[PDB]
Design an enzyme around this catalytic site. Structure first.
Site, PDB file in Angstrom:
ATOM      1  N   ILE D 159       0.904  -0.985  -0.145  1.00 40.79           N
ATOM      2  CA  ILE D 159       0.139   0.037   0.150  1.00 40.79           C
ATOM      3  C   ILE D 159       0.910   1.217  -0.169  1.00 40.79           C
ATOM      4  O   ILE D 159       1.518   1.701   0.883  1.00 40.79           O
ATOM      5  CB  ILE D 159      -1.143   0.088   1.144  1.00 40.79           C
ATOM      6  CG1 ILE D 159      -1.815  -1.234   1.239  1.00 40.79           C
ATOM      7  CG2 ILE D 159      -1.730   1.393   1.344  1.00 40.79           C
ATOM      8  CD1 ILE D 159      -2.650  -1.438   2.512  1.00 40.79           C
ATOM      9  N   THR D 160       0.877   1.996  -1.130  1.00 43.16           N
ATOM     10  CA  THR D 160       1.347   3.155  -1.233  1.00 43.16           C
ATOM     11  C   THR D 160       0.965   4.240  -0.411  1.00 43.16           C
ATOM     12  O   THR D 160      -0.424   4.426  -0.416  1.00 43.16           O
ATOM     13  CB  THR D 160       1.305   3.686  -2.800  1.00 43.16           C
ATOM     14  OG1 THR D 160       2.204   3.098  -3.587  1.00 43.16           O
ATOM     15  CG2 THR D 160       1.913   5.281  -2.895  1.00 43.16           C
ATOM     16  N   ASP D 238      -7.614   1.471 -16.896  1.00 41.55           N
ATOM     17  CA  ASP D 238      -7.184   2.280 -17.884  1.00 41.55           C
ATOM     18  C   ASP D 238      -6.570   3.565 -17.695  1.00 41.55           C
ATOM     19  O   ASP D 238      -5.603   4.325 -18.153  1.00 41.55           O
ATOM     20  CB  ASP D 238      -8.309   2.516 -18.990  1.00 41.55           C
ATOM     21  CG  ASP D 238      -8.959   1.286 -19.845  1.00 41.55           C
ATOM     22  OD1 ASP D 238      -8.203   0.397 -19.598  1.00 41.55           O
ATOM     23  OD2 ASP D 238      -9.661   1.483 -20.773  1.00 41.55           O
ATOM     24  N   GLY D 240      -5.205   4.499 -14.309  1.00 35.87           N
ATOM     25  CA  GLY D 240      -3.813   4.329 -13.849  1.00 35.87           C
ATOM     26  C   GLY D 240      -2.639   3.938 -14.808  1.00 35.87           C
ATOM     27  O   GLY D 240      -1.435   4.586 -14.515  1.00 35.87           O
ATOM     28  N   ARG D 241      -3.093   3.202 -15.689  1.00 31.84           N
ATOM     29  CA  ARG D 241      -1.856   2.850 -16.612  1.00 31.84           C
ATOM     30  C   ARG D 241      -1.201   4.111 -17.426  1.00 31.84           C
ATOM     31  O   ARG D 241      -0.131   4.214 -17.534  1.00 31.84           O
ATOM     32  CB  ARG D 241      -2.353   1.637 -17.681  1.00 31.84           C
ATOM     33  CG  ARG D 241      -2.505   0.439 -17.014  1.00 31.84           C
ATOM     34  CD  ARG D 241      -3.518  -0.494 -17.734  1.00 31.84           C
ATOM     35  NE  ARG D 241      -3.502  -1.997 -17.090  1.00 31.84           N
ATOM     36  CZ  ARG D 241      -4.355  -3.037 -17.602  1.00 31.84           C
ATOM     37  NH1 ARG D 241      -5.255  -2.869 -18.435  1.00 31.84           N
ATOM     38  NH2 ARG D 241      -4.171  -4.264 -16.746  1.00 31.84           N
ATOM     39  N   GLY D 330      30.263   7.762 -17.504  1.00 37.33           N
ATOM     40  CA  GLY D 330      31.197   6.984 -17.240  1.00 37.33           C
ATOM     41  C   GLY D 330      31.354   6.642 -15.898  1.00 37.33           C
ATOM     42  O   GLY D 330      30.546   6.478 -15.227  1.00 37.33           O
ATOM     43  N   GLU D 354       1.266  -1.580 -11.453  1.00 43.41           N
ATOM     44  CA  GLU D 354       0.366  -1.081 -12.205  1.00 43.41           C
ATOM     45  C   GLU D 354       0.156  -2.092 -13.586  1.00 43.41           C
ATOM     46  O   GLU D 354      -0.500  -1.752 -14.471  1.00 43.41           O
ATOM     47  CB  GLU D 354       0.602   0.436 -12.914  1.00 43.41           C
ATOM     48  CG  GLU D 354      -0.806   1.231 -12.874  1.00 43.41           C
ATOM     49  CD  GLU D 354      -1.743   1.438 -11.845  1.00 43.41           C
ATOM     50  OE1 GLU D 354      -2.899   0.811 -11.958  1.00 43.41           O
ATOM     51  OE2 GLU D 354      -1.147   1.939 -10.880  1.00 43.41           O
ATOM     52  N   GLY D 355       0.479  -3.434 -13.143  1.00 43.00           N
ATOM     53  CA  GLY D 355       0.254  -4.515 -14.105  1.00 43.00           C
ATOM     54  C   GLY D 355       1.617  -4.456 -14.793  1.00 43.00           C
ATOM     55  O   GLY D 355       2.143  -3.591 -15.355  1.00 43.00           O
ATOM     56  N   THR D 356       2.207  -5.619 -14.625  1.00 48.03           N
ATOM     57  CA  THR D 356       3.638  -5.896 -15.080  1.00 48.03           C
ATOM     58  C   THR D 356       3.492  -6.040 -16.738  1.00 48.03           C
ATOM     59  O   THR D 356       2.464  -6.090 -17.063  1.00 48.03           O
ATOM     60  CB  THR D 356       4.240  -7.380 -14.638  1.00 48.03           C
ATOM     61  OG1 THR D 356       3.685  -8.546 -15.363  1.00 48.03           O
ATOM     62  CG2 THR D 356       4.139  -7.567 -13.102  1.00 48.03           C
TER      63      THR D 356
HETATM   64  C1  LIG Z   1       6.489   0.057  -4.705  1.00 48.34           C
HETATM   65  C2  LIG Z   1       5.126  -0.795  -4.799  1.00 48.34           C
HETATM   66  C3  LIG Z   1       4.040  -0.066  -4.624  1.00 48.34           C
HETATM   67  C4  LIG Z   1       2.707  -0.565  -4.781  1.00 48.34           C
HETATM   68  N1  LIG Z   1       1.802   0.095  -4.415  1.00 48.34           N
HETATM   69  C5  LIG Z   1       0.414  -0.631  -4.521  1.00 48.34           C
HETATM   70  C6  LIG Z   1      -0.566  -0.006  -4.344  1.00 48.34           C
HETATM   71  O1  LIG Z   1      -0.741   1.013  -3.856  1.00 48.34           O
HETATM   72  N2  LIG Z   1      -1.930  -0.710  -4.335  1.00 48.34           N
HETATM   73  C7  LIG Z   1      -2.058  -2.127  -4.902  1.00 48.34           C
HETATM   74  O2  LIG Z   1      -3.066  -2.558  -5.064  1.00 48.34           O
HETATM   75  N3  LIG Z   1      -0.604  -2.760  -5.275  1.00 48.34           N
HETATM   76  C8  LIG Z   1       0.481  -2.162  -4.957  1.00 48.34           C
HETATM   77  N4  LIG Z   1       1.714  -2.717  -5.578  1.00 48.34           N
HETATM   78  C9  LIG Z   1       1.653  -4.180  -5.802  1.00 48.34           C
HETATM   79  C10 LIG Z   1       1.824  -4.404  -7.293  1.00 48.34           C
HETATM   80  O3  LIG Z   1       0.748  -3.834  -8.251  1.00 48.34           O
HETATM   81  C11 LIG Z   1       2.197  -5.778  -7.842  1.00 48.34           C
HETATM   82  O4  LIG Z   1       3.717  -6.090  -6.874  1.00 48.34           O
HETATM   83  C12 LIG Z   1       2.653  -6.183  -9.351  1.00 48.34           C
HETATM   84  O5  LIG Z   1       1.431  -5.588  -9.946  1.00 48.34           O
HETATM   85  C13 LIG Z   1       2.756  -7.672  -9.375  1.00 48.34           C
HETATM   86  O6  LIG Z   1       2.123  -8.683  -8.451  1.00 48.34           O
HETATM   87  P1  LIG Z   1       3.269  -9.766  -7.659  1.00 48.34           P
HETATM   88  O7  LIG Z   1       4.309  -8.890  -6.923  1.00 48.34           O
HETATM   89  O8  LIG Z   1       2.419 -10.579  -6.935  1.00 48.34           O
HETATM   90  O9  LIG Z   1       4.037 -10.539  -8.708  1.00 48.34           O
HETATM   91  P2  LIG Z   1       3.413 -12.030  -9.359  1.00 48.34           P
HETATM   92  O10 LIG Z   1       1.905 -11.671  -9.695  1.00 48.34           O
HETATM   93  O11 LIG Z   1       3.690 -13.083  -8.352  1.00 48.34           O
HETATM   94  O12 LIG Z   1       4.146 -12.246 -10.768  1.00 48.34           O
HETATM   95  C14 LIG Z   1       5.594 -12.584 -10.824  1.00 48.34           C
HETATM   96  C15 LIG Z   1       6.242 -12.846 -12.263  1.00 48.34           C
HETATM   97  O13 LIG Z   1       5.341 -13.657 -12.932  1.00 48.34           O
HETATM   98  C16 LIG Z   1       4.518 -13.176 -14.103  1.00 48.34           C
HETATM   99  N5  LIG Z   1       3.534 -13.544 -14.344  1.00 48.34           N
HETATM  100  C17 LIG Z   1       2.378 -13.418 -13.477  1.00 48.34           C
HETATM  101  N6  LIG Z   1       0.953 -13.795 -14.088  1.00 48.34           N
HETATM  102  C18 LIG Z   1       1.447 -13.784 -15.300  1.00 48.34           C
HETATM  103  C19 LIG Z   1       0.711 -14.444 -16.291  1.00 48.34           C
HETATM  104  N7  LIG Z   1      -0.709 -14.657 -16.295  1.00 48.34           N
HETATM  105  N8  LIG Z   1       1.370 -14.490 -17.541  1.00 48.34           N
HETATM  106  C20 LIG Z   1       2.675 -14.289 -17.724  1.00 48.34           C
HETATM  107  N9  LIG Z   1       3.409 -13.952 -16.763  1.00 48.34           N
HETATM  108  C21 LIG Z   1       2.824 -13.795 -15.365  1.00 48.34           C
HETATM  109  C22 LIG Z   1       4.986 -11.777 -13.578  1.00 48.34           C
HETATM  110  O14 LIG Z   1       4.850 -10.826 -14.874  1.00 48.34           O
HETATM  111  C23 LIG Z   1       6.052 -11.561 -12.898  1.00 48.34           C
HETATM  112  O15 LIG Z   1       7.297 -11.349 -13.754  1.00 48.34           O
HETATM  113  C24 LIG Z   1       2.860  -2.073  -5.160  1.00 48.34           C
HETATM  114  C25 LIG Z   1       4.051  -2.667  -5.366  1.00 48.34           C
HETATM  115  C26 LIG Z   1       5.065  -2.016  -5.237  1.00 48.34           C
HETATM  116  C27 LIG Z   1       6.302  -3.021  -5.589  1.00 48.34           C
END
Ligand SMILES: Cc1cc2nc3c(=O)[nH]c(=O)nc-3n(C[C@H](O)[C@H](O)[C@H](O)COP(=O)(O)OP(=O)(O)OC[C@H]3O[C@@H](n4cnc5c(N)ncnc54)[C@H](O)[C@@H]3O)c2cc1C
Ligand SMILES: Cc1cc2nc3c(=O)[nH]c(=O)nc-3n(C[C@H](O)[C@H](O)[C@H](O)COP(=O)(O)OP(=O)(O)OC[C@H]3O[C@@H](n4cnc5c(N)ncnc54)[C@H](O)[C@@H]3O)c2cc1C
Ligand code: NA
Ligand code: NA
Lengths: 367, 369, 367, 369
Positions: D159-160, D238, D240-241, D330, D354-356
């Site tokens: 949670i930010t 949409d 947030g991205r 450098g 915000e979605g990897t």
């Molecule tokens: C600094 C920070 C602030 C944040 N703030 C918030 C916030 O305010 N509110 C909130 O709700 N969240 C927040 N988050 C959470 C953040 O959105 C998640 O960490 C992130 O979206 C990914 O989820 P995860 O960490 O569980 O990775 P995972 O879901 O465990 O994924 C791990 C890996 O597997 C891959 N993967 C997962 N599913 C698939 C798939 N279906 N197909 C192919 N590859 C896949 C991923 O791309 C990734 O490389 C925050 C995170 C950070 C680090």
């Protein structure tokens, strides 16, 4: 399935639909045959001309459409998705009229512009060489020397020429098709983009009236430099349309062909390849419109146009190479169009300033 | 302007020297015209075979040259730098003899192997169908058992040297363990070949489909046990993937030599230096990768992962180097006055056959599971 | 799970197993703590030294192991997979002894080499600057000026120095830790690679015996140029080991973590990312060994070593950036090592000749 | 040395001008010290809020500035060029008010919206759990119905602004259509926050977990219908991205300005020109892509595909530009004497939240199916 476009007006949307209707009945049924045989589409330019599509961005007072670049570039993009070699020629025609419109006298424009922008003529642009000189004489000039890489060479109604008369040592000419002393070499044998010929020119004691010199004697280099940005914008929009055509093929094929008991688009690895292609097409379209929108407001757009040409032509080479991959073995055959699109994209990285020369220009603009 | 090679002996160095001589005399002076006209090179495979070049890696007790892969693959590379289509065919010939050599009866080997490795014969390999390239198991050409034999009914596709080989290694359905392997002679009754595919490049040696119309075959022609086929086809993958890695490296090296010569005749100055530098790195890296896998094979160790990596790496490099070589020439690079536009068209299919680069990645990921 | 290596002998395999045993009990239990606090591993070099690992490639006659580079580089790779900053220092120690071994007199080598290669000392290399001069005097030289970026600065037993005495205007020195007039600045605050300090040096009317000049007066530039290829080979092998460590983490994590009802390695898109990483690690290892194998045979290997450094350090930056991605949100925290590995890889693209300077060198070798 | 912007009016131009002034006076002089010490910036969000900068895009009838996205996003870009961590928090505040604004009752809006947009408050958004980041539907924080309300038992993560916001937008399980949305005040009983995560970068605004221990909540705090939650969370994607696309572009622009200045102070000559040219192309391309999507939104048209493309493109560009900016400096680029080593550490997480970027690609491919 057609592109969802950002347009300024109702009349612009209706111009887009008109282009799509003409391209699908005049261009699409004949493109594969002419490119295979390397033959010229006689009469195709007259039909584009009569619908107003050859003079869209020039002022209405001179017989043009007075359309902004934000609208004109997107029409060009729609043409290139059907026949790239014809789209390049449409762009070249715009440049060929630029000297007279910007630097010509009021007398010169009344004489020739209406004809050039009527839709019945086609123009070519002639600056590249493999030292071509115009020497003074009573009432005009005599021309001697050679020129290379002229699009529409041997087939155009008129030619824009640059010839030597140091800094201010160059001059610009409007040369007619019927010029005594003028001849053209055989068409170049290229890897692709065959329909509209590309030729070299030879001038043999060719005598020309002073009334055909465009702008002041010595004003040559300034004239030619003033047309760089607009050319790069043209090719950006052409490369974007060919990338879009290759993406549409692959997307269609990946939704029918099956392997390992599923449609190939449903294999996540293949889905990711298609996703990178689509992102590259949309980034290239966004970039050329951003430069266009600056030009329409009278703002500088020189750095932005180099970036757009660079981005779009690198995108087309990557997307067409990947569209063959999506098809597999059949993609390597001439039963499909994707092998032709890959051959067409390579020359876009090279002309209107090579991409290395674009990087140099961007660098000089940060120094 | 000749590759500085790491080789295990003086003997190997002279064999490379022999290859450069034959390739420059026989292949180089006719290649542009045959690729442009799309015609077959009569006499060419007969000349390479008499020099020993069509059977290098196989054991001497059967008529091969006994060479390790560290030498065989680099001879293949030197060939592919003159004529890519020909070297592809050399590679296929090696695969075509592989099922008999590893799986056959001593009696079967005695009959047929010495003629295959003699230098006068040409082999082809037949597995793919229209509904099954990447997915092997979904094949459907039918071989149904008869009194003392089999009857074959169906279709095959993408056969390199189709309609011109002396023998064919076939895979057809008899029943997952439902697949068998067959050695099919060129004079087989009921066997016919369609017209050559019209391709973007690699024109000289034809690629064709095949049709089996009540083709009765002797049961002594079956290679291995009934239902052993998929295991046979699987065992050839590692070897074929290295062959093509070597071919793609030599096509990239040929395109690099063109561009270096042109940039010196300076065009280099007027950021071409950095583009050429990245091209030279790509070729060297692809060569070292295929050789690392070769030495593992020569030592009798596991080399499956490393062979997938070599093929992926080497074909991604050919596509990038040939594309940048047209770039170095400028506008004349896009004409048929030079060779670089052909090299670019030849590199694309390499990313596709012998297992597409998406299948290569899928193999590698599984090896990490 | 350990790397399957191509080795020349039984004794080389047993050297590899020895390195792995020492690294796992002397390096692995302490690396995260020392890198976090930025503190020095006192006693770690003595333990590596006593097992013979600090003098592997130098001749046995002088107390070294006489191992080929094909074996030595792979030992270095195994060290770097556990602690990269310690591996860089092991490589620097090899270069620090090169002048005396190659250009020193028979008298100079009997005096100092046994000690340098005993395993009880550690050496540093000092050439970079931010114009450092040695002026003649009765019986020797006086040194004045500044030096920068010395690995092990302030902590080494001896220093290899280059100072001005045009073409043949430079000279090389073996400087002792107890040198009067010599001091060191504070350690640099870097993004990573903290354990072994990096410092600048200052020479204040520092007087030195003529018997410490290595090779002839003026032979300096030739001496320094003779060590380029070997340094680039060292860093290639270090970058390869750090890339391997980041790949092992990600592979392990992708086999446990689940999403959408499956192990994440089983999502084909993620599997492809891991597959590109593994191919890049194996290509980098193949390339440095090919150069090594040339050096062992007395063949030129200069172009090949530049290619290897370039390939391997670009590979490490790509693989470590992608290993954080495989981990997701946790990969961005200090509960795991992948964030540290990404910070360590960036400086490898920069030192021992920047990658732009490597491209320049390769170009000059085709011109 | 200031971005030439395309803006819809003179009024928008002055708003950009106001942003550059506040950011250079309030954010720029303290940023290096707070990121280095890992401490919270007291007073900073109070100062931006009084200038109107924390509620630009929302309707004036509720206290926002009424701005279109074509202007809002470019203000966000100017902020992120001074302090990335702060601009991320501005973006989150917009998302935090989104469920109430689009889904609530007129009575609910009247109570709470004017205080949120006043400039004195800070919102946070809570969806992710340890077993569920990418996969939303697998969440498990329990909200079970009581007499006139709900009782909440469970855990949330990442949670930010965790532990410092005035209100929280929560998602908890009540039963696929089993999810509901809640507006949770900062003084809620049974609610507690863990210690701040130790991250590679972006230190100033904390990221924390949360714990609900028999947290009874009034049923009038529920936003929308019971079981409507996943539809609410989906509708915010949409927006947030695009926020994050704008943040990544401004971080890349900041790293580009550092490297251009350094290369001029020449270091450019001694192939750095081509590296800088590719950096400038990447930034311009990312800016044009997010703006194209913004104008579609402002016009009330579909913009989902284009918003995924913008976020992927802009974050891949920040990682590449920040990495090459250290390269331009450098050895001194690798020290804490300059800002570029920090910019590189900040860009990595943008590829992740915000979605990897793997989820972005999966969204885009589905839109092609
Ligand atoms: C600094 C920070 C602030 C944040 N703030 C918030 C916030 O305010 N509110 C909130 O709700 N969240 C927040 N988050 C959470 C953040 O959105 C998640 O960490 C992130 O979206 C990914 O989820 P995860 O960490 O569980 O990775 P995972 O879901 O465990 O994924 C791990 C890996 O597997 C891959 N993967 C997962 N599913 C698939 C798939 N279906 N197909 C192919 N590859 C896949 C991923 O791309 C990734 O490389 C925050 C995170 C950070 C680090
Ligand atoms: C010139 C030429 C010569 C040939 N010679 C021979 C020969 O001598 N002998 C022989 O047996 N064959 C031969 N072939 C056939 C060749 O091996 C196949 O064309 C190729 O391996 C791919 O199969 P396909 O064409 O059916 O593509 P498809 O299997 O239809 O694949 C189409 C696309 O989907 C992707 N895809 C498929 N499966 C997956 C998956 N599981 N995961 C992710 N993506 C996937 C592919 O990568 C590809 O991009 C030849 C082909 C050519 C073009
Ligand atoms: Na007329
Ligand atoms: Na001692």
């Amino acid at each position: 399935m057609a592109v969802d476009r950002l347009l300024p007006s109702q009349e612009a949307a209706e111009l887009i639909e008109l282009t799509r209707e003409i391209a699908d009945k005049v261009l699409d049924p004949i493109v594969d045959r002419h490119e295979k045989d390397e033959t010229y589409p006689e009469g195709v330019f007259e039909q584009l001309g009569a619908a107003g599509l050859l003079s869209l961005p020039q002022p209405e007072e001179w017989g043009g459409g007075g359309q902004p670049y934000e609208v004109y570039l997107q029409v060009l993009e729609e043409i290139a998705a059907r026949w790239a070699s014809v789209a390049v020629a449409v762009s070249v025609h715009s440049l060929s009229s630029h000297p007279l419109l910007v630097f010509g006298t009021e007398e010169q424009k009344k004489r020739w512009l209406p004809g050039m922008l009527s839709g019945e003529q086609i123009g070519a642009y002639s600056l590249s060489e493999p030292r071509c000189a115009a020497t003074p004489t009573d009432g005009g000039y005599v021309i001697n020397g050679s020129k290379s890489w002229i699009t529409h060479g041997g087939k155009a109604d008129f030619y824009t020429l640059f010839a030597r008369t140091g800094s201010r040592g160059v001059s610009c000419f409007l040369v007619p098709a019927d010029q005594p002393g003028l001849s053209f070499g055989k068409p170049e044998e290229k890897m692709g983009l065959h329909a509209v010929p590309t030729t070299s020119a030879f001038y043999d004691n060719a005598r020309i009236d002073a009334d055909r010199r465009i702008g002041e004697e010595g004003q040559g280099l300034q004239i030619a430099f003033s047309a760089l940005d607009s050319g790069r914008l043209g090719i950006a929009a052409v490369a974007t349309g060919l990338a879009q055509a290759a993406l549409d093929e692959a997307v269609a094929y990946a939704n029918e062909r099956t392997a390992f008991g599923r449609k190939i688009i449903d294999h996540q690895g293949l889905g990711f390849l298609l996703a990178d292609m689509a992102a590259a097409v949309a980034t290239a379209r966004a970039t050329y419109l951003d430069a266009a929108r600056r030009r329409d407001q009278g703002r500088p757009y020189s750095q932005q146009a180099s970036i757009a040409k660079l981005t779009a032509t690198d995108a087309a080479m990557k997307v067409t190479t990947d569209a063959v991959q999506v098809f597999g073995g059949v993609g390597y055959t001439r039963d499909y169009r994707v092998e032709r699109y890959m051959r067409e994209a390579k020359i876009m990285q090279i002309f209107e300033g090579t991409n290395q020369i674009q990087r140099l220009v961007i660098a000089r603009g940060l120094t």
